[PDB]
Amino acid sequence: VFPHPQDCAQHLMNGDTLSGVYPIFLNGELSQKLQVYCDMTTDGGGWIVFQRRQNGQTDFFRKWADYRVGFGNVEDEFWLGLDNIHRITSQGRYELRVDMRDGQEAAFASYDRFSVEDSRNLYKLRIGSYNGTAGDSLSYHQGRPFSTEDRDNDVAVTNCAMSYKGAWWYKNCHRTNLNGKYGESRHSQGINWYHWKGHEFSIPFVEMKMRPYNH
Ligand SMILES: [Ca+2]
């Protein structure tokens, strides 16, 4: 159906049902290949996973350049890269899902719009309306630029990314911190999703993922 799938939903539509690594072609262009991890099972499948935490073996306390280009293994812990996320979210309207787990407990948050702006606009976050079980901890970050420890774009007098061991669309400073320090229970420094587990619990497994709206 789609000779050059531009996301995981188009792969799913072609008949590919197994989660794993797929090439997607941005704007359907053969020359714009990007390797991604497709979640083909959650809520019907078709998701591009663009962030994962699961074991703490990958350092996330990186700099702007690293968050721009991406790092990590898409089969393990990684960040797809802010330029890539901007390009994907510019090719249509995407929804965001955040899946989180703590042992046998699980929760999710979904937003019916998701985009980041370009480099010049500091990758500002845009999210739609919320539904789910984890609580809405991301709307606090609506409209905010991205910040890293070496590039403070937040509206705190402090450096949020340095103080809270992360990289995020910080304001003053956060309700979620999913690029924070793995396993870190000190208040607001770990992998927090406030409305699910507060600021003194670091979530051991999180995935951030996106699929075309109303798929
Ligand atoms: Ca600041």
Residue numbers in the entry: 1131 to 1345
Question: How does the study describe this entry?
Answer:
PNNs are a condensed form of neural extracellular matrix that include the glycosaminoglycan hyaluronan and extracellular matrix proteins such as aggrecan and tenascin-R (TNR). TNC and TNR share a common domain organization that includes an N-terminal cysteine-rich region responsible for the formation of disulfide-linked multimers, followed by 5-14 epidermal growth factor (EGF)-like domains, 8 to 9 FN repeats, and a C-terminal fibrinogen (Fg)-like domain. Here, we demonstrate that TNR and TNC associate with the single fibronectin type III (FN) domain found in RPTPζ and provide a structural basis of these interactions. Overall, our findings provide novel structural insights in the interactions between RPTPζ and tenascin family members, prove that the formation of a RPTPζ–TNR complex is essential to the assembly of PNNs, and provide a blueprint to explore a potential role for a RPTPζ–TNC complex in neural function.
The Fg region of TNR includes a single Ca2+ ion, and comparison of the bound and free form of human TNR(Fg) indicates that formation of the complex does not induce any significant structural rearrangement. Interestingly, the Fg domain of TNR matches closely with the one found in the lectin tachylectin 5A (RMSD of 1.7 Å over 210 Cα positions) in spite of only 46% sequence identity at the amino acid level. Furthermore, the major contact site in TNR(Fg) overlaps with the N-acetyl-D-glucosamine–binding site found in the Fg domain of tachylectin 5A, and the amide group of Q369 in RPTPζ(FN) occupies a position identical to the acetyl group in the bound carbohydrate. Consistent with this observation, residues in the major contact site of TNR(Fg) are equivalent to those that interact with the N-acetyl-D-glucosamine in the lectin. In fact, this site is also used by the C-terminal Fg domain in fibrinogen to interact with the α chain of fibrin or by the Fg module of angiopoietin-2 to interact with the receptor tyrosine kinase Tie2 (35, 36).
